[PDB]
Structure formats: C-alpha cells, structure tokens
Design a protein around this ligand. Structure first.
Ligand code: QS6
Length: 167
C-alpha cells in the first residue's frame, strides 16, 4: 500500500492521473519524482521548469554543480539528484526531444531508467515541449517500465485522450 490517490490503473504496474506533478509531488513526497530533463540539466520550461521553480531554483543550483563535475547526460540517460522539497530523490531522465531531431527509439532507453526504482511519480517522457506523441510515450512506458509508475498528466484534455485510446 502506498499514498498515491485517485489514479486510474492501466496495467499491473502503471497508473495515471490528471494532475500537476508539482502539486502531486508536494502532497505525496514520493521517494522518487522523475524530471523531464535535458542533457545539460537546464530546467527552463515544461515539467523541468515547473519542478525547478517549486524548489526556488535549488534544483538548478545542484544541477549546475553536477554538470560542472560530470559533464552532460546522454539522451536516454539519467542521474539521481536530490528531490529537494518535492521528493526524497529526483531522477532526471533525458527523453529524446523531437524538436531537436533526436531519435525516438531512444525513448525506450529513457524509460528503462525507471526500472532502477521500485516506485516513481513521473511525467510522460518526451511529451509536452519535447515534441513526441504522448500516446506513443504511454505505450512505450507500459511496454518498458516494470516497476510501479504513477504518471501525472497536466492537461485534462490529453489525459482523457490517453485513457480513451489506451489498448
Ligand atoms: O511539456 C508539456 C507541457 C506541460 C505538459 N507536461 C506536464 N506533465 C505533468 N505535470 C506538469 N506540470 C507542468 C507541466 C507538466 C506537457
């Protein structure tokens, strides 16, 4: 039993809700919140900008130190950093950005990072400003993630489309 509430169950291990991931993280305090990161951990907009804003820019400060030490992430890769006031940990995962021409097949690799964590609160990778089809992202999530994932979808209209079209 965990504290996630109001989710629709899609599969044995994947759950979905119309929610603001920032507000969901603030209420649940999950062990892991996933950020829709880029390779530079520049959290300017989309989910990343919203998560970072909710940390009063502490996520960005920590991220800049991480990059200065380690260099950029790989597309499809991840790193674990602090969850600040939102979660114990933040798993920064880099899905491909279609608006940069990145290969969509890397979306499966990106979701594989979730399997290193037993339970996660997450957005749909490569959705929103990353330019992928959220319906495809949900399919890859379901077919790749084996651990327990709670997906927060900000837009009510998209949420309804994802549920109604789910196979
Ligand atoms: O990137 C586009 C634009 C926003 C959508 N993604 C999100 N999904 C869950 N919670 C969120 N809070 C803020 C954004 C957000 C998709």
């Amino acid at each position: 039993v965990n504290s996630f509430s109001g989710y629709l169950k899609l599969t044995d291990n994947v759950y979905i809700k119309n929610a603001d991931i920032v507000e969901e993280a603030k209420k649940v305090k999950p062990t892991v919140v996933v950020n829709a990161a880029n390779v530079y951990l520049k959290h300017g907009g989309g989910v990343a900008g919203a998560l970072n804003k909710a940390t009063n820019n502490a996520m960005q400060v920590e991220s800049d130190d991480y990059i200065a030490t380690n260099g950029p992430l790989k597309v499809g890769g991840s790193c674990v950093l602090s969850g600040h006031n939102l979660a114990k940990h933040c798993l920064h995962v880099v899905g491909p950005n279609v608006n940069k021409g990145e290969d969509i097949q890397l979306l499966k690799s990106a979701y594989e990072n979730f399997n290193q964590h037993e339970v996660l609160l997450a957005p749909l990778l490569s959705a929103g400003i990353f330019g992928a089809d959220p319906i495809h992202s949900l399919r890859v999530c379901v077919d790749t993630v084996r651990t327990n994932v709670y997906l927060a979808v900000f837009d009510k209209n998209l949420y309804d489309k994802l549920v109604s079209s789910f196979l």
